[PDB]
Design a binder for this molecule. Sequence first.
Ligand SMILES: [Mg+2]
Lengths: 1212, 134
Amino acid sequence: MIKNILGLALGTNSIGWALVKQDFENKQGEILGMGSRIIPMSQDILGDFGKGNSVSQTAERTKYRSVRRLRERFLLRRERLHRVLYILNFLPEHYASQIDFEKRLGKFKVETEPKLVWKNTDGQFSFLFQNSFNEMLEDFKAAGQELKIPYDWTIYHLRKKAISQKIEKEELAWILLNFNHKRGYYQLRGEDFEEEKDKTFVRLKVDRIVDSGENVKGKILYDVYFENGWKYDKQVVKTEDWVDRTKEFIVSESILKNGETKRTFKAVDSEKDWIAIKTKTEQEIEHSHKTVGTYIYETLLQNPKQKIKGKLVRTIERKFYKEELRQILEKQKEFHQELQSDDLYNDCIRELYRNNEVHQLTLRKKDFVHLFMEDIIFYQRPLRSQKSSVSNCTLEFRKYKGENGAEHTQYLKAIPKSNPYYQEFRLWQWIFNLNLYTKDNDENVTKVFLNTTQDFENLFEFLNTRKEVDQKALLKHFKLNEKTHRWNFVEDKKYPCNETKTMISSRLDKVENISDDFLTRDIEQKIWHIIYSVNDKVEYEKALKSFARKHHLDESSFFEAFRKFPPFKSEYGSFSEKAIKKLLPLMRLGKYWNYAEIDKYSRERIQKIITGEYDENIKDKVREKSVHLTIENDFQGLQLWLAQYIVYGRHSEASMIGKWNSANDLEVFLKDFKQHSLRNPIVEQVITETLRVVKDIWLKYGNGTKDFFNEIHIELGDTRYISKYISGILSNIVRVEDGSDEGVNSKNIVPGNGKITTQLKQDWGLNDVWNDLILPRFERMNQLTNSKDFTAWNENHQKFLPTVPIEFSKGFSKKRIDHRHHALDALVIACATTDHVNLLNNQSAKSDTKRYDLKKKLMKFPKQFLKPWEKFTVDAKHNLESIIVSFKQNLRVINKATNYYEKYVEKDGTKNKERVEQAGTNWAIRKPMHKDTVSGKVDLPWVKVPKGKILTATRKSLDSSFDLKSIGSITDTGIQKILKNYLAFKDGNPELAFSPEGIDDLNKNIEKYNDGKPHQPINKVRVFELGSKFQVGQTGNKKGKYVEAAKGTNLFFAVYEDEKGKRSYETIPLNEVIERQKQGLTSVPLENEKGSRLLFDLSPNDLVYVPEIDENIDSNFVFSNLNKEKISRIYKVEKTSGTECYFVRQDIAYLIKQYDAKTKIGELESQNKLQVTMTDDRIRITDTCVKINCDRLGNINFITKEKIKQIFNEFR
Amino acid sequence: LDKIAIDTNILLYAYDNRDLDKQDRAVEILLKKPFVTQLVVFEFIKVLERRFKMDKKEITKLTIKLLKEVIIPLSLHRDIYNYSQFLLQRYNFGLSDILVLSDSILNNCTILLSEDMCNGMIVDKKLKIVNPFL
Ligand SMILES: [Mg+2]
């Protein structure tokens, strides 16, 4: 009779709502309201989520956290090294003097930057290792290149020297710290592959390409021949890049069973591929048969100018560093008695593990070599347990009373899919589900060859001995043939067949020297537990050895067979082991079918169902399905559903329907919603904001009255999966409980489609309404363009319609340049009755009489569809011109954070490791504080610096992008002159001048451009800039780092006005906001130093109103009479810099034409937004604007008498 | 090297002469040109009018002379109320005392020469309360 309709259009980041109260029978209706909620994503995310490349904030947060964690681990390693070296007394006196060892153990003292190889006295820095430096001078002299070297090259020479000679304790400290500082690549899992692992990187030149006669697609392919006698396995087509060329590949040789190597080939590129560089350095170290440090040395010996880090040896295996460091420690351990002492080794162990008795006792049995290698420097933590995220069993529950005086339920974790119980359960399911078919008459030959229990028992026993059943094996088991029969499933697919038991049997037969009775169910379960539980290589070896020792078996080949056991695949079942253990006795048949192993509950239920009595848990469905279970023996060869109902008492998953009696249920569900519970964050945030807006609309227009909504319609417009979820969520409101509306989704939810939307928009005049509404931007565009092409006249409607020139029609779309199309689509979906969508989806009728009634009732004769009521167009246009858009804001600067760290707490006279919350208050900054690139402060006499600005410079690589002015923007004047000379010699052509070959030519002939004076080669130059960059920090060298404000952190823009009326504007940096909010103050200062009271602050996506020039708004208030002009004079803050604030008309979503540098024409000039009003008046908005705040539903909120009453009625 | 502020009791002991030694201490403190917050001035005026029953004109003359010569008044800060709310979370003093502390701290004062304020502990790691009569 009277219907309430809620149409929702959910975009990628926008939500359009429309609530309407209508009467269809009388063609009478009025619109209750509509609105648009915009979640602000930039165009980058919109263009990226179609494909997806780290499209999440949590992803970058995790990246930063991981980087910080690695840094902290390195610092902890250094701290432990300092403590150990101090307690052993190996460090130099001055170095040990500047490190705390009482409160902040192992950390440098405040405002200290000590160095191991440099001593400070009366402002002079002196080297510490003079004799070693002289020794390296003598080497070079033997090499005979130069006598000039930095004092800090000695580290590599001494690293080589410790291999066969004694050096000082400070030498050992320096080498150990250097090794800590550079660990190397490593893989924790291990699981050693094929015995070869060749992967050898070689560079081979093709000799000839004999034609192989492979004519494919009109082209004959050749082969590849190398000097060594190798051939590329893949074919070659183009001969231009393969004849007599040196081609390099990483090649792996695998010994096949036939007895010959199966060499693999893969293209690699020098100094461009990480694996290629790694392997090249690996081989270069390997064929030298020397330590990596020694290799670096020798390279330094050959060429002193060779850079080491990042270029010569970047990535190699950690085992090389391990080998070198062991060698040096075992060499030095002889000379230094301290490395063989025991009092110092107990003292250092106690220092490291004072509160750990166990680790102290364990490590008291090792030597210093183990501490330096395997406990401090090269220790790598194992992976954190991932079992916490495993899903819960849906059948087994536990009830317990907690400390909170209640009784709640803990779930059971899912059984691993590798569990032999689960494997057996799945195999039983497949064996019971098998039904056979023939090929001649295609009859169901099953139940003939599989009728008695003996056949099923034989099939099970046959399938135990295999790992994977298929067509051939299944057919041969019955002596059948491929040409005559099938098994109702894919003829070329294989299914799991409990491979764990077969693999265990194969290994236990390979070990031999035992009887064929060691393997049983208990042994299989214990083997599964041993392999799956111990996920660590050495501990797996120990567990296997212990298992072989306890049982009376020879540990000779069993260990070899079981050491290469493949780690089990990461997968878990739906249920747990408890459910499978309960259910399995029921399914089995024959000797495996037993009534004793069944528990009390299932046995009693079976007795009740065979007795035929009445239980409160038995329905007529049960007696319908289980009428064939007359005797207790008939429970043979059961299936999952019947056995599940027998065990637990519920038939499958019927859900709980669900009904929400008011917004209390919806807000409870929103509060209890779990984050990261969807595929991607965008969808979950869209759904959450949809729930928020529907909650707000129900609260407002229902006034706490249940069942206010009657129908809800959903339109979507990659995003397809959200439809079913949102329908399931929203079903819980207008579901009908009488039984006429049952199922997964309510019949009330009527999804829409683009077809009905566009049809109704064109037929009902809404397209014309949209076009006339969006015209004003178009004639403004015509005026600024000085052309009439943007509006084209038409005589069929006799008016001007929007149009675009073809060059600007690439991604042009009329409907997408205003935030109100969402509300318009919500309105059209709302009034779209289910008859409309049913008719447009079922146009094929097969009879005119069936649908002619709908043709008459919905369509005005097949020409145009009827309007819902007389005043549809007028009301729609008025409401669209009288709506304001509400934007979600993100202003999180700081937030409270909780830190839980492990510590040995003293309780009940004993020490126990446990979690402790960090004391005090620790805020967490919720925005990036600055940009990544760091600039240093420099001064230049030849540049005039205005006050309030500083000169800052940073390094940049040299490339062709350097022009004359760029050279003029370099800190080093001599470099400027040399570059000018070279560019002059290059005729002022930056492209050809600054090519890498040209850069090398400059470097080698640098005398020709520095007037014959020597100068070092040029690769990077420090370019300067006069600006205002703040400091990163205030302690240590953090004062020497200057950075720029990060993107999207100019959140607050303050507008003050002095006593006489003048308005002043400032921008508050994020640092000031952080400090003010930490102190408990407000974000923006209440009073600028100028002596002006603060009118208001502005944030991105804020709303302001600009009064007309003639009118004066001082205490107007009255923000309910919002007509066309007042709403059209509402602007939104977009960005801010200094005293400049940029606004955009609130209804503008996408500019008609963006700004370009060539033609220099744009809808909103170069900044794509104006500091002033867009209209002809061109008045600076900030001088007269007034801030406006709105709720989610786009309703303006202003003070009232009741609000003033309540604001301190609440404190009473 | 560090700013100094005073509490109303310092002025009261400077004026009242019932205990001469504390009066001498207060006078000595006032000799160093200490800063003062307007709330202290208003409390002093209220006490003089109420406790000591001096008439309005002489009280105003005394206040004007003191502000012109002896002590430096501190401009009232706009963030006094928010900071006073923040200070109440950790410290349990009187509300007027909290306001005095907030206005002193917001003006970069590092010492608050007071007596009835449990001298000794730092306040927000920015200001400390010192009893000069001990
Ligand atoms: Mg007081």
